[PDB]
Amino acid sequence: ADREKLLTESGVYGTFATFQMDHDWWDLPGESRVISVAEVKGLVEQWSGKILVESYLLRGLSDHADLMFRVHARTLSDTQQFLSAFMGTRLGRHLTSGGLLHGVSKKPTYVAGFPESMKTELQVNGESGSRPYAIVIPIKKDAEWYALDQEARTALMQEHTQAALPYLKTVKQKLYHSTGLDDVDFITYFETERLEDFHNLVRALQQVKEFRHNRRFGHPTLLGTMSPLDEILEKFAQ
């Protein structure tokens, strides 16, 4: 019910955690693993009041990673507890952590200075689909970007928004402000049924003048499929 209270509202932290599965996990008998999966489900369900957790299968799409959590929380302290709890699970004890990025979502900064025609197009909701592809791209702006005045950056971001608009219907997007919580300024999240559209989306943004201000683009670029936690861990049950 309060699902969207975290996915859209501001002041909401957003955390990306990646995990890789150890070798010993398959030494466990199939029965012992199926049980282990249930412990996680409950931990998530027990935490379903304070946070929100969505899972993605990165195995075979992203290098050196199997599982990613997108955890929403009113405070990062709560996410700290959950991740510690998750890694304390018998399943989690057979997981080696592989990267962690936090980012708080905020109300738009440059959109207000856009054309009223452009503002409208942005209210085109996007792509709402079941089990879509998911992409995560961290970004760091160069010192030059921050030196610019508010009007200049606003105009640059209008050029940014303009090139992306014809992909709004097929590519969902969300932005996390990450500066000061790690080594990145932004975390970008995307959902798509057609990866070819998302690709064309990116080269289209390679055309704008904004791209040259990106000191860091990707590294790592997390690609994966979106699916309920049960089916992912089920694939780990064999």
Added chain:
Amino acid sequence: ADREKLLTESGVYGTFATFQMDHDWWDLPGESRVISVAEVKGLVEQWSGKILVESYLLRGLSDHADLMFRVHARTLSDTQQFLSAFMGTRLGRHLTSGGLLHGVSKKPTYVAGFPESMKTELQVNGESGSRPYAIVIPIKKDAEWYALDQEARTALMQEHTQAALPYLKTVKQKLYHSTGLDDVDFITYFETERLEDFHNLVRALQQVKEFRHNRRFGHPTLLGTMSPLDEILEKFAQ
């Protein structure tokens, strides 16, 4: 029969996976190894209906690698399943991944604006030989490249193509558009019986003005021999 329908048609994703074999693999008794090899062979044959898998021996040609998969599929979802099954396999659980790159094939962008004399020579298929050397080079363009207009880049790529033409008869080439699926913009793939030609090919392309725009060239530069999957896995028995 259904084979060439993927290697030439557009919309076909192409995935490159590299693996290295652990030390613990040789601690395993031979009997355990022969079964592990057998588990892999059938699984590949089991997946021969939805995708295409070719194997390459990087052992002794590429550092920290023994095996490379060139997997073609209309959807990355299928490739994700295959790779996940493969790395869960008893052989695969003794494999460490060493890079993973996706790239969708596309309809040529600059060829249409070429001289008709150049277009024709490009339609020359190339040299078809058995068990050739294979090189894979990922490439990332600098921010300047994407800033240029359609005419400048086109002229640059004609200068590119021009230097490459005398190698068409001895070097097969194919290009995958990779931006947004990982940390690279392109994936280049080559087959040749003559490595000395491939070398001369590259320095010839080092002279052109396009080359200076490659922020990343190689890293890693994958070299290997092309051969059936059985023969590679055969070497891990004994």
Added chain:
Amino acid sequence: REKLLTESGVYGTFATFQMDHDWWDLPGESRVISVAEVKGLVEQWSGKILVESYLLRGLSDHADLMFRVHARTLSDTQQFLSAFMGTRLGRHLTSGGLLHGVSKKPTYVAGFPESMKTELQVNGESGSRPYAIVIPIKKDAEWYALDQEARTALMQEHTQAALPYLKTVKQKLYHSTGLDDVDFITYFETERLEDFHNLVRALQQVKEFRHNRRFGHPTLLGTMSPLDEILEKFAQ
């Protein structure tokens, strides 16, 4: 404790550790005895150094524990850290970070206008169990070429944009050149991260930010809880 967190000439070390998998393969009572060994080690050193504990687990990747050790002589800090890694607990820890930084009298403060000076004597965030952020910084070559005046001016614009955060963000600077691969170690306590997030974005606008060659890497983030509260979470 005030002698070490305030005075100059007091070194500050930042040790980061991550726990092994096979630590959880150890029987539950062994972890208890292990934890009990560490407290006695810190206690025997309390008369020479000051050890503060942090919990990076679930906030800072490839990290579980962080120490902030203060000592007027770095030798004392060396004996301790080798001993901690010698302890049964420490033999199951892969250290992944170690930064030293001495404290010194302010360089560019006296040059500042005294309106700003008085605002720097203003208390600051006095919180309990707050978030903690450690950022290492390396200046470029151009920075050190600039004369004192040109640099003192740049730190004025620096101190300026930071003033609205002084009450919600605690700060401490460690001079770290020639002890590791960074020039400065910045340490911050705060109950509000969005506040601290603002402080950085605000500081990104000054021209002094241009002269930061290495910014972050790694950017450590965790909660500042007492030692026992972190070690009790380990035995389970």
Added chain:
Amino acid sequence: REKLLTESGVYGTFATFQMDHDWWDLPGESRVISVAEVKGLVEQWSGKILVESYLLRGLSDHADLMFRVHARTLSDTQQFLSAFMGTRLGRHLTSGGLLHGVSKKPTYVAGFPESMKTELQVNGESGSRPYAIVIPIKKDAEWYALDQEARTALMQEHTQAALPYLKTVKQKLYHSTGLDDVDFITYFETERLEDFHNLVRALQQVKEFRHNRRFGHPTLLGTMSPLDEILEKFAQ
């Protein structure tokens, strides 16, 4: 053999290996049997390739042994190297870098003065068990942008600075572009490392050096000796 160390069209492969900890857990007798397997494999391949060995243990970090393998085709080098790492000894070896480079007939020497051409025909240093250095090199985009005359002139300046070291430093160059991540592989033999050192700083003065985008990384240093004596030293 000498038809391979000098003729053009000859591929040259550099393989580095590090010895595991588990190898020394093995009793001495178990190793000697393993050593014997390698000797035969080399002799079995002595028809299609040529193999020279180097002791990097204690001179280059994270390395004990290096192979310099000459062959007209890399496939043969591939078979040998794949077989070698399958050897009982090779199953206790972790691979540590691999660089190929085909030898070709000189490009710029022809445009040199005959006074310089002659001095280059001075064979070099022939010594027993000399030091050996291997340096991979990548040229910047600017170098390849130059037309044929400047590079020719630049390499004449290169050759000029190197001449007083010909009698004490043997050298050979491999064209490596397209087979890995480097453009060239340089190989040197010298009884006097101090000579080789003075040689390198002498070449740091020329205008060519600035066009070297990548210089070394890794820089392989080692001693040259028969394969038997190296492997024997890995015994007991």
Added chain:
Amino acid sequence: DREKLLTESGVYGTFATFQMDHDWWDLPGESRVISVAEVKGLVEQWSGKILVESYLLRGLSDHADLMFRVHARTLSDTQQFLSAFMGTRLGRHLTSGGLLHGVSKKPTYVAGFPESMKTELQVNGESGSRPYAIVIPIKKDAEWYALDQEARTALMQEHTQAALPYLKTVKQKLYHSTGLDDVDFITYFETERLEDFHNLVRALQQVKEFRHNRRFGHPTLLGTMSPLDEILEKFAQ
């Protein structure tokens, strides 16, 4: 003699760092104490051709426990010693963590300095017991080597000028390392007061030479100087 390696030129200097495995603590204490005794002798057995000094980097430098500063007239001898050491039972529980060689030479630019500066330079420095020790590798940019002998000489005089007030509290040593590894220089320092050593470096960050340092540190090795036995004693129980 004893002194022929710490001052003379043509003497190679090698820096080897090692980290201690986890399996080392699986061994019973006495078995380790014996291993310590084995190492002591190997050093003394080699005490004729080379010189070995040891440093504790455990808890001061990341990912390192022990460092050797080995001086030898030939690198071949140092190669043998390290191979024996890493083959030693203690050494089989050691993982190597970086290796840099550098030959000491007679000064290149000092001759062109004022004798007022030369005199102050003849002050050897501070000889103290168990001082801190710092190792900083350095690589100069291509621009530096493009400069003529006079400019570089003047730049190095500016370097020397800034360092002088630290001569009495900071010992300095320079190794010419180009061609033996991936660095051009290796710098070694001893001081009882690290606070002095810090001020020394930012003072040297002001000069125009510093911008020519393509690589400065990476890694920057810090540690304590002490006899090999007392260091190894800590690796026993």
